[PDB]
Amino acid sequence: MFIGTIILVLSFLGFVFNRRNIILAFICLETMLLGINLILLRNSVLFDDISGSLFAIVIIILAGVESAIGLSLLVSYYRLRGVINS
Amino acid sequence: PFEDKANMPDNVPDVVEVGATSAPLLSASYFIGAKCKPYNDDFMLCREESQGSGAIDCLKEGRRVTRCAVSVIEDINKSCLDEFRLHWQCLEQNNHQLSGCRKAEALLNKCVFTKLNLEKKIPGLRPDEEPVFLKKDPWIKPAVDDFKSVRAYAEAKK
Amino acid sequence: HFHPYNTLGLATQSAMVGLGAGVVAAAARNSLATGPRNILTTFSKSGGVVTIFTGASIAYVFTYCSAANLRERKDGWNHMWAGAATGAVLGARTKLVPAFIGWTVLCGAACGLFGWTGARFNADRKASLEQSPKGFVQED
Amino acid sequence: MLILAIISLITFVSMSKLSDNRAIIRLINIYLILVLVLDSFLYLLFLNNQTYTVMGELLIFNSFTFYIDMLIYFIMIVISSLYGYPKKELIILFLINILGALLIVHSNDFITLFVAIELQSYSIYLITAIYNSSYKASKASMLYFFMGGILSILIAYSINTYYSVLNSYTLHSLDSLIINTLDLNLILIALSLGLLFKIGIAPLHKWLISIYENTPILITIYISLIPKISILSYLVLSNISINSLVISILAILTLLVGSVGGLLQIKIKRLLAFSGLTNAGYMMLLLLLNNNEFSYLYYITQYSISHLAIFMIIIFSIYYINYINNQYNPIIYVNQLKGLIHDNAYLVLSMAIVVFSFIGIPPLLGFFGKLNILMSILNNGYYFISIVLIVASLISALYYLYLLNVSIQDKNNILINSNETVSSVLSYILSSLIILITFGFIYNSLIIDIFN
Amino acid sequence: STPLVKTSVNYSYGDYPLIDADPHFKRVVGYMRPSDYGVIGLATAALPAGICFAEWLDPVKGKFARPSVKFLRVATMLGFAVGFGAAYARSSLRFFGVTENAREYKKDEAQMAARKA
Amino acid sequence: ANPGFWNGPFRYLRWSAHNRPHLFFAFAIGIAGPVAALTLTPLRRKYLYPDHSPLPQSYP
Amino acid sequence: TGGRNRCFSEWQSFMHCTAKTDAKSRAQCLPNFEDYMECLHHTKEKARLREIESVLKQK
Amino acid sequence: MYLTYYFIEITIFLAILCTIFIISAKNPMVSILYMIALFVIAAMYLYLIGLGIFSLLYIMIYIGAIAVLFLFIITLLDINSTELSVKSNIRDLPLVLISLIVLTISGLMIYSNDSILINKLLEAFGNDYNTIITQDWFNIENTTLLTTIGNVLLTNNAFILLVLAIVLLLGIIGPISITMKHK
């Protein structure tokens, strides 16, 4: 569980110290959701069959919709598709 | 790294077993079934009732249920030796697709029920069973080139 | 009954707690402006928030254990007479008006009068002392 | 019967001519009839508040949660009437936001909880920027999205550690485990602080507030109230940490001081945003309890009706300003509505009683919200937190009365010549009349929840 | 019947719509619940005009009009559906007591007669 | 050219399947699924029970 | 929601302790509970192994 | 014991080496190029740990869909990048990130089992030292199944599947009603 906490913490304080490039912050926040699954999957492997790995397939299916709403909302961080502005 | 531990000893308080042999016992799987079935049932029953308390059915049933299977394989090694032998010889090819040797099955089963008078009672009443002569199914691909002459001769002589 | 405290034993550990708080927080406050530079000049911005933390423990808990040595037996009335000294370091925060530092001393004392232990427990039905037992009813 | 309503009216918004001001009348009347013919579950609700569980992971607590979803239906009917009578095609995701909120008020186990808090949060991210021809909403939605993502992985990391210490998931399996391994306590306060993203506890403070001022007013009514009740109703339904063991009390101390120290605000939206923040901070104090939910269940309704009311009143006060702000947001300054008592002063009376609500003068609300709050506090023994709650109430009352004192000074030049704008007036009159006549039936509820 | 020895637990009375399986239980079942009803079977009819009462809710959607045009059909469908759930909310119970309890008169006999399942 | 129009349903399904037919013939499959899945409970007429198993631990 | 576990064998002798209400006897399940815990994490197993390898280290 | 095939598990050094690239890139999108390398190292980790199934799931759905979508966006409306981690932009970096890395290491220590001390903080770091787990033999496993049991649990917990149906519903209706801009 070193393997998941370290990638989670580095994604987290990458999301803190991110004074460049909004999308690197956005993908660090993405990689949090796979830093957490390396914790979850190895806890399930150290335990058993499907108890936590059900939550793992849930968080994968939902992390998809996370990135989908995040893109389709980042498109509207401005005007829409493109016009005159400043 | 799935390293192997291979320690050795022998423990006192019971008479030792006799082990069993390779994957060819899959051919003999039903053959130990109907004969050694109540031994099997009492073994697994005594295991399940002692909730967590394993390693106490070893001296009674862990010896007994292996004694029965050793007796069955000795009977089948004297009764139908080569009929067993060509049948598992078929059955080690074809991925143990147990459909894939269903003609030497009838030879071995006729030999067993002839001499050691057992059966293959697959429990369930609805369909037909082991004689199917498939007719819409997945019979075989390489039809046991050393064994087609055997069932052919059994159709011929018998 | 009670036990008098190790005044140095609380004091140096509390001063290290205050200095660690001045490192982890009073140097964390460097996000606030556009004067950038990282390490040598962070404490140019932040010399006036360090020892506001570290001096606070040396004001407070030193006074607290000394009050426990003077008015003993570990009462809450130490705290009101403790935290006033904390206001003295608050007085060192603003050397403008000594009337205002006496003001912040007495208000910090009244603040310290109450914060003895937040989230008290083991009081299943609270706030009902019971008298001597003679089949009591008017408590719980 | 919400899923059937959603799948019906997503098909109904499909193949629609983009009239899109009638479908909300159908959703309003549908939720009205659903409440009217689904209140019959209250008889089968409680003999002794007997819970009922869907498939082991979802819980139906018939006294608490069966009131919470009724409040959700009620305020949704009010919002749906507020959009009737400037819009885009959005009530599908209003209803699915409701579906997520009701799942988290029914979620026994963390898989359902996490799915539903994230569904709910996605709904908030979307509703923030449906009005996409803004520069306010464009910034606010992305800010809400990124921090909801952080707080989402904080949720999931709390529960993943919870799974790491115990191979179960359910809090039904916590079952007064009194050996209380310390990491169970730390996991649970981490899960608490994770769910407490929405209240904007004073270290997590400022970020919600710019979002509330950067949404249109027809939206910031909806998301200063839905997750405010939702995540806390989960948090009181299961009492995670019996006391705080000083972690949460510090959070509410710096909240209820350090969000009421946010006194001087000229923007209206900021002002009642801090109001809805600090009154949400109130009900965090009886998250610090055990076996106490009546004060919480009463304080939600006897806050949220009035929160809805003050937003509806400053909706009605757009008509009287002789200036407006941006296309999406009309009335952001306090000093816009100066001489309102020389306009239709009956709504000034309503605004008066709903702000005297929030300060808690006795005979309408505060002696029945804050009285139950304070008896729940002093039942436990949190003596200091009582007097800081009192200080919070006074200093909150100061910026509350700021609204009434700017409401009724004197008008420059406006009295009367107009047409009418009504038939939603019975909604605001219903909320104001239920605010200042609850002192009549303040004892019937005391018996009814004693029997549930 | 109709499945394995697996069980499907559902004691459903909520705002997320469910139903029941083939059989193994003591609570309310699938096909018996639509039957064993009463003269409250027009309760679903009472909602059948209620969402069709949106025309009565039309107090000037536009300026000076009435009779919302023929999407009421859609409303009529919802006017059925919720009321159907309200009829399906009339689980009196399955063989408990201390209620209205016509089940011990109109469904005790069916569990008597069908003595082979 | 004419699209589909609802109010005559026997006419609608005609002048759906004849002018924009490519969703019609999809949804004909979409209705051939579950409706035929409900016309089986007489049509199997108790045809078969599968009868599979994990380990059968027996009784006393 | 508990698949065929490598630690399922300590639910039952924990849950049959909480079959009766001895979680309000508050200690009758603690041997059962910490045996469940040693199935979870093998803590005292691991300390026992650390002890015997420390004894191995001094030969 | 095939010396390198025992330290083939410790690939976390490549994970931290990729993630130290992931926040200090030159271009804005060479970072998200490295992100798929992070995901495929995660897949290598999961295949090595005993679950190659979710390795192939991550290859199918993360770098198959969402990373593809990051690359899909970062072509059009490319944001104005600050150039790199300059020293003036590495200002106030070490002064909080060092303490934060220490506090989060103590959080990973707080994931430990039950000890009310700092002994559990050192215990998880020595967790590999006193222990190597012992596998067992097949006692009555009838049918072969790896992710089949995941669907068995998805049948038992069917309601979360029918609700994440709704979250995928939201994932398609939202981007319609936030970007299409009907007329």
Three-class DSSP category at D452:
coil
Check residue F2 and give left, alpha or beta (phi > 0: left; psi -120 to 50: alpha). Answer: beta
For chain E, report the end-to-end CA distance as a whole number of angstroms. Answer: 9
Residue-number span of the structural domain to which C78 is assigned: 2-119
Q: How many CB pairs under 8 A join G and H?
A: 21
Write the CB contacts of B13 (distance below 8 Å, at least 6 apart in sequence). Answer: B59
Residue type, D103: L
Q: What angle do CA H78, H81, H83 make, to 5 degrees?
A: 145
**Residue D302 near residue D421, CB atoms below 8 Å:** no
Give the pair of three-digit tokens for residue D303: 């806050």
Query: How many whole angstroms separate alpha carbon F43 and alpha carbon F10?
Result: 29
**Residue H32 near residue A27, CB atoms below 8 Å:** yes
Report residue D58: phi and psi, to 5°: -125, 140
**Residue D246 near residue C119, CB atoms below 8 Å:** yes
Among the partner-chain residues A49, A60, A76, the one whose CB lies closest to the CB of H61 is A60
Write the CB contacts of H5 (distance below 8 Å, at least 6 apart in sequence). Answer: B1
Query: How many whole angstroms separate alpha carbon D73 and alpha carbon D35?
Result: 7
Q: Do the chains contact at E11 and D53, CB–CB below 8 Å?
A: yes
Q: How many CB pairs under 8 A join D and H?
A: 75
Give the Cβ contact number of residue E63 at 10 Å: 5
List, in sequence order, every residue forming a beta bridge with D59; answer none if it has no partner.
Answer: D53
Burial category of F32 from C-beta neighbours within 10 Å (exposed 0-12, middle 13-18, buried 19 and up): exposed
Write the CB contacts of D306 (distance below 8 Å, at least 6 apart in sequence). Answer: D354, D357, D358, D365, D431, D435
Write the CB contacts of E87 (distance below 8 Å, at least 6 apart in sequence). Answer: E37, E40, E41, E43, E44
> Which residues in chain H have Cβ-Cβ distances shorter than 8 Å to C23?
99
**Residue C132 near residue C102, CB atoms below 8 Å:** no
Three-class DSSP category at D333:
strand
Task: Tell me the nearest-neighbour CA distance from H64 into chain G, angstroms.
Answer: 30
**Domains in chain H: boundaries:** 4-183
Question: Looking at residue D243, what DSSP letter applies?
Answer: S
Q: How many CB pairs under 8 A join B and H?
A: 7
> Which residues in chain D have Cβ-Cβ distances shorter than 8 Å to G33?
177, 179
Q: What angle do CA F37, F9, E51 make, to 5 degrees?
A: 85
Q: In sequence order, what DSSP letters do the residues of B46-62 get, joined into one string?
A: HHHHSSS--SSSIIIII
Query: How many whole angstroms separate alpha carbon E54 and alpha carbon B137?
Result: 62
Contact status of D43 with chain C (Cβ, < 8 Å): no
Q: Do the chains contact at F60 and B45, CB–CB below 8 Å?
A: yes
Residue with tokens 């008597």: E112
Q: Where are the beta strands (DSSP E) in D51-147?
A: 52-54, 58-60
Query: How many whole angstroms separate alpha carbon D430 and alpha carbon B106?
Result: 86
Residue type, B147: F
Q: Per the structure, how many domains does chain E have?
A: 1
Task: Tell me the nearest-neighbour CA distance from G29 into chain D, angstroms.
Answer: 10
Burial category of D117 from C-beta neighbours within 10 Å (exposed 0-12, middle 13-18, buried 19 and up): buried
Query: How many whole angstroms separate alpha carbon B56 and alpha carbon A29?
Result: 55
Q: Do the chains contact at D114 and A58, CB–CB below 8 Å?
A: yes
> Which residues in chain D have Cβ-Cβ distances shorter than 8 Å to C126?
378-381
> Which residues in chain D have Cβ-Cβ distances shorter than 8 Å to A51?
163, 167-169
Helix axes D110-128, A53-74, angle to 10 degrees: 0
Chains F and H physically touch (3 or more Cβ atom pairs below 8 Å): yes
Helix axes B104-115, B63-79, angle to 10 degrees: 100
F60: closest chain B residue by CA: B45
For chain D, report the end-to-end CA distance as a whole number of angstroms. Answer: 24
Torsion of CA A63, A68, A74, A80, to 10 degrees: -170
Question: Looking at residue B94, what DSSP letter applies?
Answer: G
Q: Where are the beta strands (DSSP E) in B1-158?
A: none
Q: Do the chains contact at A47 and D129, CB–CB below 8 Å?
A: no
Q: Do the chains contact at A51 and G3, CB–CB below 8 Å?
A: yes
Chains with 3 or more CB pairs under 8 A to chain G: A, B, D, H
What's CA B32's distance to the chain center, in Å? 6
Q: Do the chains contact at F51 and B126, CB–CB below 8 Å?
A: yes
Q: From the candidates H89, H91, H100, which should be mutated to test the interface with C, based on the most C CB atoms within 10 A?
A: H91
Resolution attained, angstroms: 4.3
Residue C126 lies in a domain: no
Helix axes D268-283, D367-380, angle to 10 degrees: 40
Q: Do the chains contact at D111 and A55, CB–CB below 8 Å?
A: yes
Residue-number span of the structural domain to which E45 is assigned: 1-117
**Residue D40 near residue D85, CB atoms below 8 Å:** no
G37: closest chain H residue by CA: H113
Give the Cβ contact number of residue B24 at 10 Å: 16
Query: How many whole angstroms separate alpha carbon D344 and alpha carbon C100?
Result: 48
Query: How many whole angstroms separate alpha carbon B28 and alpha carbon E66?
Result: 84
Query: How many whole angstroms separate alpha carbon D368 and alpha carbon D355?
Result: 15
Q: From the candidates B43, B49, B122, B126, which should be mutated to test the interface with F, based on the most F CB atoms within 10 A?
A: B126
Write the CB contacts of D423 (distance below 8 Å, at least 6 apart in sequence). Answer: D85, E59, E60
- Choose among D95, D245, D108: nearest CA to D171: D108
G10: closest chain B residue by CA: B52
Write the CB contacts of H64 (distance below 8 Å, at least 6 apart in sequence). Answer: none
Report residue D408: phi and psi, to 5°: -135, 45
Helix axes D383-407, D248-258, angle to 10 degrees: 30
Query: How many whole angstroms separate alpha carbon C5 and alpha carbon A25?
Result: 50
Q: Which of residues 149-168 of H touch D (CB under 8 A)?
A: 156-160, 163-164, 166-167
Among the partner-chain residues B41, B48, B124, the one whose CB lies closest to the CB of F51 is B124
Give the Cβ contact number of residue D343 at 10 Å: 19
- Count of all residues that appear for chain G in the document: 59
Query: How many whole angstroms separate alpha carbon D145 and alpha carbon D200?
Result: 15
Among the partner-chain residues F48, F49, F58, the one whose CB lies closest to the CB of B45 is F58
C30: closest chain H residue by CA: H92
Q: What angle do CA D201, D294, D287 make, to 5 degrees?
A: 25
**Residue E76 near residue D3, CB atoms below 8 Å:** no
Residue type, E72: L
Helix axes B81-92, B63-79, angle to 10 degrees: 100
> Which residues in chain F have Cβ-Cβ distances shorter than 8 Å to B127?
48
Burial track H139-177 (b if 16+ CB lie within 10 A, e otherwise): eeeeeeeeeebbebbbebbebbbebbebbebbbebbbeb
Helix axes D294-316, D367-380, angle to 10 degrees: 150
- Count of all residues that appear for chain C in the document: 140
Q: From the candidates H139, H142, H144, H152, which should be mutated to test the interface with F, based on the most F CB atoms within 10 A?
A: H142
Residue type, F14: R
Give the pair of three-digit tokens for residue D440: 């009549």
D47: closest chain E residue by CA: E98
Write the CB contacts of D14 (distance below 8 Å, at least 6 apart in sequence). Answer: none
Q: Do the chains contact at H15 and A60, CB–CB below 8 Å?
A: no
For chain G, report the end-to-end CA distance as a whole number of angstroms. Answer: 49
Q: Per the structure, how many domains does chain D have?
A: 1
Chains C and B physically touch (3 or more Cβ atom pairs below 8 Å): no
> Which residues in chain A have Cβ-Cβ distances shorter than 8 Å to G40?
47
Q: Do the chains contact at F51 and B41, CB–CB below 8 Å?
A: no
Q: Do the chains contact at B1 and H135, CB–CB below 8 Å?
A: no
Give the Cβ contact number of residue G58 at 10 Å: 5
Query: How many whole angstroms separate alpha carbon D59 and alpha carbon D283?
Result: 22
- Choose among D343, D338, D365, D368: nearest CA to D354: D365
- Choose among D145, D61, D152, D168: nearest CA to D114: D152
Report residue D54: phi and psi, to 5°: -90, 110
Report residue F41: phi and psi, to 5°: -55, -25
Q: In sequence order, what DSSP letters do the residues of H8-28 get, joined into one string?
A: SS--HHHHHHHHHHHSS-SSH
Task: Tell me the nearest-neighbour CA distance from G25 into chain H, angstroms.
Answer: 22
Task: Tell me the nearest-neighbour CA distance from C38 into chain H, angstroms.
Answer: 4
- Choose among D52, C114, D124, D24: nearest CA to E9: D52
**Residue B33 near residue B41, CB atoms below 8 Å:** no
Q: Do the chains contact at B126 and F60, CB–CB below 8 Å?
A: no
Three-class DSSP category at D426:
helix
Chains with 3 or more CB pairs under 8 A to chain C: D, H
Query: How many whole angstroms separate alpha carbon H140 and alpha carbon B59?
Result: 21
Q: What angle do CA D65, D71, D72 make, to 5 degrees?
A: 90
Residue-number span of the structural domain to which D108 is assigned: 1-452
Give the pair of three-digit tokens for residue D451: 């029997």
**Residue D274 near residue D251, CB atoms below 8 Å:** no
Among the partner-chain residues D55, D99, D161, the one whose CB lies closest to the CB of H166 is D99
- Choose among C47, D150, C27: nearest CA to H96: C27
Question: Looking at residue D107, what DSSP letter applies?
Answer: B
Q: Do the chains contact at H99 and C28, CB–CB below 8 Å?
A: yes
